Amino acid sequence: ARKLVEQLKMEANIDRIKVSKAAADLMAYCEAHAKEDPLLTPVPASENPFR
Amino acid sequence: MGIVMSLIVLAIVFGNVLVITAIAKFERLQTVTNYFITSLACADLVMGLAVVPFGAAHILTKTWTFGNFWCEFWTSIDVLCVTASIETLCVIAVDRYFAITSPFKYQSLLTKNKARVIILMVWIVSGLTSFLPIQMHWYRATHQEAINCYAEETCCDFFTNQAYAIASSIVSFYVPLVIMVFVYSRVFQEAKRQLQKIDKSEGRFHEHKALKTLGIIMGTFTLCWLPFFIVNIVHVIQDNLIRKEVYILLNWIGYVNSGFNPLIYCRSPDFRIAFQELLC
Amino acid sequence: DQLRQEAEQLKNQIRDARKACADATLSQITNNIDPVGRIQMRTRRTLRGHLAKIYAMHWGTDSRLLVSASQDGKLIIWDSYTTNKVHAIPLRSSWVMTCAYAPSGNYVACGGLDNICSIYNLKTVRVSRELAGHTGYLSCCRFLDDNQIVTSSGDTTCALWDIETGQQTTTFTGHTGDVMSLSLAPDTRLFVSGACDASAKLWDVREGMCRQTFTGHESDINAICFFPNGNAFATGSDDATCRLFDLRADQELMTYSHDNIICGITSVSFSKSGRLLLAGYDDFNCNVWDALKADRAGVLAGHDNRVSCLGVTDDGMAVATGSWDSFLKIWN
Amino acid sequence: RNEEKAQREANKKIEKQLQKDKQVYRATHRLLLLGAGESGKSTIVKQMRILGIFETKFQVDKVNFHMFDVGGQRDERRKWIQCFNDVTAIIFVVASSSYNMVINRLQEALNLFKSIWNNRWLRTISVILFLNKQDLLAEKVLAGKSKIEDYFPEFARYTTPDATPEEDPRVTRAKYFIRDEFLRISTASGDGRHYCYPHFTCAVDTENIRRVFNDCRDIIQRMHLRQYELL
Numbered sequence A: 001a002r003k004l005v006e007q008l009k010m011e012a013n014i015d016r017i018k019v020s021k022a023a024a025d026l027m028a029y030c031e032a033h034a035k036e037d038p039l040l041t042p043v044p045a046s047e048n049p050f051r
Numbered sequence B: 001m002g003i004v005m006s007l008i009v010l011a012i013v014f015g016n017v018l019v020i021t022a023i024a025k026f027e028r029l030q031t032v033t034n035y036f037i038t039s040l041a042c043a044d045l046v047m048g049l050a051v052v053p054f055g056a057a058h059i060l061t062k063t064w065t066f067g068n069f070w071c072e073f074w075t076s077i078d079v080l081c082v083t084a085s086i087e088t089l090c091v092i093a094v095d096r097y098f099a100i101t102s103p104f105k106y107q108s109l110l111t112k113n114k115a116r117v118i119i120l121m122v123w124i125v126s127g128l129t130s131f132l133p134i135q136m137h138w139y140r141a142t143h144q145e146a147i148n149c150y151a152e153e154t155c156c157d158f159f160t161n162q163a164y165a166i167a168s169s170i171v172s173f174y175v176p177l178v179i180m181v182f183v184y185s186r187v188f189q190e191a192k193r194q195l196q197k198i199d200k201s202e203g204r205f206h207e208h209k210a211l212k213t214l215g216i217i218m219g220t221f222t223l224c225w226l227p228f229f230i231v232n233i234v235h236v237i238q239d240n241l242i243r244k245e246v247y248i249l250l251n252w253i254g255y256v257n258s259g260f261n262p263l264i265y266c267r268s269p270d271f272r273i274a275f276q277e278l279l280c
Numbered sequence C: 001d002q003l004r005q006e007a008e009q010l011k012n013q014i015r016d017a018r019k020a021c022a023d024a025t026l027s028q029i030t031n032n033i034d035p036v037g038r039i040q041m042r043t044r045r046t047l048r049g050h051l052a053k054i055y056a057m058h059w060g061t062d063s064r065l066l067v068s069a070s071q072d073g074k075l076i077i078w079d080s081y082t083t084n085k086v087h088a089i090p091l092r093s094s095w096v097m098t099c100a101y102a103p104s105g106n107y108v109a110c111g112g113l114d115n116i117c118s119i120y121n122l123k124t125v126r127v128s129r130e131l132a133g134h135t136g137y138l139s140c141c142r143f144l145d146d147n148q149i150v151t152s153s154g155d156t157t158c159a160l161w162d163i164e165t166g167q168q169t170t171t172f173t174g175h176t177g178d179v180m181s182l183s184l185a186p187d188t189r190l191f192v193s194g195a196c197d198a199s200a201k202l203w204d205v206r207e208g209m210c211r212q213t214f215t216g217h218e219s220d221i222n223a224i225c226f227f228p229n230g231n232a233f234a235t236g237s238d239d240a241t242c243r244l245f246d247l248r249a250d251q252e253l254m255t256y257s258h259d260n261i262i263c264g265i266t267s268v269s270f271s272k273s274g275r276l277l278l279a280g281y282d283d284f285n286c287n288v289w290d291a292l293k294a295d296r297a298g299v300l301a302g303h304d305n306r307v308s309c310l311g312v313t314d315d316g317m318a319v320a321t322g323s324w325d326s327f328l329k330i331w332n
Numbered sequence D: 001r002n003e004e005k006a007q008r009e010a011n012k013k014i015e016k017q018l019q020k021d022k023q024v025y026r027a028t029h030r031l032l033l034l035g036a037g038e039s040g041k042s043t044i045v046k047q048m049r050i051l052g053i054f055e056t057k058f059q060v061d062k063v064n065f066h067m068f069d070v071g072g073q074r075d076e077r078r079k080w081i082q083c084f085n086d087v088t089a090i091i092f093v094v095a096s097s098s099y100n101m102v103i104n105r106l107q108e109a110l111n112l113f114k115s116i117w118n119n120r121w122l123r124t125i126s127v128i129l130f131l132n133k134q135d136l137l138a139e140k141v142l143a144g145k146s147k148i149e150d151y152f153p154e155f156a157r158y159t160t161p162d163a164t165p166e167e168d169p170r171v172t173r174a175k176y177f178i179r180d181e182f183l184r185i186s187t188a189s190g191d192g193r194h195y196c197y198p199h200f201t202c203a204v205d206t207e208n209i210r211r212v213f214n215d216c217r218d219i220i221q222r223m224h225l226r227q228y229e230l231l
């Protein structure tokens, strides 16, 4: 009954930031942590444990 | 005829090699039934790679350019391959009979260990009738032409007595024929019964396939290997009745059957996908 | 009644606010980034011993051991380095659909059509506790801690359990369809869930109240993965699409789909850096996407049946897949 | 050093146990019992057996059968049915005397059967059909206030089809019309992989287990015949 209306009212009033800032933050994190991805950058076979 | 013989050799080798490599490479084709298929393919490949070229060279040059030992080895390999290429078909027929007639107990009865024993026994029986009585001189004939051929080291035909000719034929061809006939008759009866049941149950809303399949399977083998195994006894029972050219022609017609086994026993859609995956 | 008409307004307000906040799309911002390029991986290990198809697996916290479940009623704990088994736990019921590996490496849990979540003690292998209370089949379970676990079942509810006493602590309600998957945040302070009503929700583990709702999809959701940054997640549904939602922006960002695929999606996972998104499909193979470009970078073929499980090690050294062909493969 | 040997010994023991259990797993046959409410599903189980899950195991002629009854989950949506794509057969139980009662039960059963038949994951699974309550139907037909034509208009232009009574023509006509109602849905949808099977059962019946045995044998035989391109 009124539970759905109350929940919609509760979730309506929240702080929302611009999508551009979120995209920039995601890109910055991906670029910063891009040097420690063995799948993305194939590590030498000397340190490869599965091979 | 050299071009025709080379084409025959290429056709024999290519199909068997492709079947063997397709079975070995993939993991979804490793079934208990496929072990018999790969055994048959190995036998056919050994035949087409060992006995056909030397026979072609002998029939072309009309003079054996090797020693007596190599001729005896060639004859033994021929007999071994011919004997081992038919008992595998008999085993396949028996396996299908067991699979269809008794569906509940099939899974227990053939287990992979049980199969590697059957194949080894078949190969041992095949080798026990080819190498043993040929490396020893038990099969040697008695007429003067036979001794003249045996003494000579530049030519060697096939001369045999009555006992070996009857026994080898019985072991190789005649025994594995009645079993296959009975098996396929029972399978046809079961298929007809199932078709009648389906038609009686749900015929108001909705036997060529079984006839076609069994006809192809039985007819190719019978037409390929039947006349030779009759003239084999005929030329021994009655003297001066079968010419050497006719004997060689019938024997070479028998050889061609080894190149048709992939075309008959490897029509499954899984084999089609496997053949399309590689070399395509 | 009057209220139902009244309710729609709030939806219009939320849609207008989300449309207003959308300054620019992710594709426009991420256009000068150099592409990753073609990525090729080859099978390194193969694990055999399961008599039936595999639903679930979970990597260990040490990226060395892993657990797996099958429909023959047996859990096996493999050693990926030496490709030899360690344990083989029989099950009372042969229908299991999930499994989990505790962060402390001491317990392994599983469940299925029977509405019971069993917990096993590896370092004592006997049943330790049995949690009951769900009225539907379980779908997932993740060890929040060595003493408490959270589960999601087919009765449109998710619950938090207490292993010591075997009693429910918090119950999460609000979904309409059957909940199929969940994933925890790195700090274990929030978790998401995807039901069959094409809607994913954000839950608060402490308060026990739904915070946000996302309804971008149009079919049932089958898998959910959480971005390493802790402010995004990706979902996969039956319409051969993947979507990258956001929390702070409170809207989706990008969709991953192609016109040559008409199958479903069974599992979704990320990478250590988050650059690559891995998703399993019903085409008997897996795909690798680019998170910031939505451009395919490779395909992982080699499975003879549909892929139902997918996971990446904590240190990101290798990825493991499971299929209905009763085979587990390791891709480096 | 010795740790590798210990792990090898443990792996050997586990592999031996798995090899031992493989034969037992392969020997048994699995069945699924699916039906609607008020059909009489609980009765069939007991009679045959005496001879949110419930597993019943019965053995016939040294063959193992293992039947499941998933009654815990009661909902129109069935997301769990993808798990039963490797069973030998599906047993469908429906009350054949339910046509006159609203929440129509027979139409709901027909719709459920149609949904089951056309499922993507159940494209190669046969169905054994049990038409339950074969004497309530006869009692209702013989001097009954309600008529099948009122609820089923197609009954006005139906003929008795090879029919073997045992009976009055009316009950035989009703039984065969109800059976053909299910048979029609089955014939149209699929070519070969699966075939529906009908039966007539009641409370006083002890041959149901033999019927299941024969139907499973026929299913396996037909599968093997079709695999080798003979049917």
Ligand SMILES: Nc1nc2c(ncn2[C@@H]2O[C@H](COP(=O)(O)OP(=O)(O)OP(=O)(O)O)[C@@H](O)[C@H]2O)c(=O)[nH]1
Binding pocket: D035, D036, D037, D038, D039, D040, D041, D042, D043, D044, D132, D133, D134, D135, D136, D201, D202, D203, D204
């Ligand atoms: N005369 C007669 N009565 C039956 C027959 N089968 C079932 N019944 C009656 O109908 C009822 C069927 O209910 P149960 O079999 O106990 O359970 P159920 O209603 O089948 O369970 P669901 O159908 O799954 O809801 C029983 O109370 C029986 O007395 C039958 O063959 N003949």
Ligand SMILES: CN[C@@H]1CCc2c(ccc(O)c2O)[C@H]1O
Binding pocket: B078, B079, B082, B083, B158, B165, B168, B169, B172, B232, B251
């Ligand atoms: C020269 N070729 C041989 C001669 C006789 C013979 C063959 C095959 C099987 C037998 O049992 C035989 O007796 C032929 O392949």
